[PDB]
Write a protein that binds this ligand. Structure first.
Ligand SMILES: Oc1ccc2c(c1O)CN1C=CC3=C(CC4=C(C3)OCO4)C1=C2
Ligand SMILES: [Ca+2]
Ligand SMILES: [Cl-]
Ligand SMILES: [Cl-]
Length: 124
């Protein structure tokens, strides 16, 4: 679920304000997205958007209001490491893995402050 994604980011990058840092970064971090991502961080976000797109195409999974962000799973954080619980159902596990891979990806990409609040109408 969305709140758990924020909380995953905060596990992978303890020094971070997820909503301040990663919402409205680049072309893809943010509601929707367009064009080509502007750096590796933005591309982490594009991968996350497409991971969600894939989950909605799982004939087996029908998320509340069609948004996988509404779906809560079980995970834990230990020493910077995210573990998705294996007892998550297949749809929960898929979302869990989109969020974990994105948090891990965010933690390894350089953070370019110029791309925060990018003029997307123009650069994306
Ligand atoms: O990184 C993010 C990835 C995407 C999103 C967010 C992120 O910060 C934050 N965020 C906050 C509210 C809503 C969406 C998406 C959506 C809503 C509402 O209703 C329609 O679909 C949303 C997506
Ligand atoms: Ca997005
Ligand atoms: Cl565009
Ligand atoms: Cl759930």
């Amino acid at each position: 679920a969305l709140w758990q994604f924020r909380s995953m980011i905060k596990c992978a990058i303890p020094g971070s304000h997820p909503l301040m840092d990663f919402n409205n970064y680049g072309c893809y971090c943010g509601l929707g997205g367009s064009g080509t991502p502007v750096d590796e961080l933005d591309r982490c976000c594009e991968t996350h958007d497409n991971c969600y797109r894939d989950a909605k195409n799982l004939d087996s999974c029908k998320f509340l209001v069609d948004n996988p962000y509404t779906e809560s799973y079980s995970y834990s954080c230990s020493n910077t490491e995210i573990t998705c619980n294996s007892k998550n159902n297949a749809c929960e596990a898929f979302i869990c893995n989109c969020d974990r891979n994105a948090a891990i990806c965010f933690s390894k990409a350089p953070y370019n402050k110029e791309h925060k609040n990018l003029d997307t109408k123009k650069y994306c």
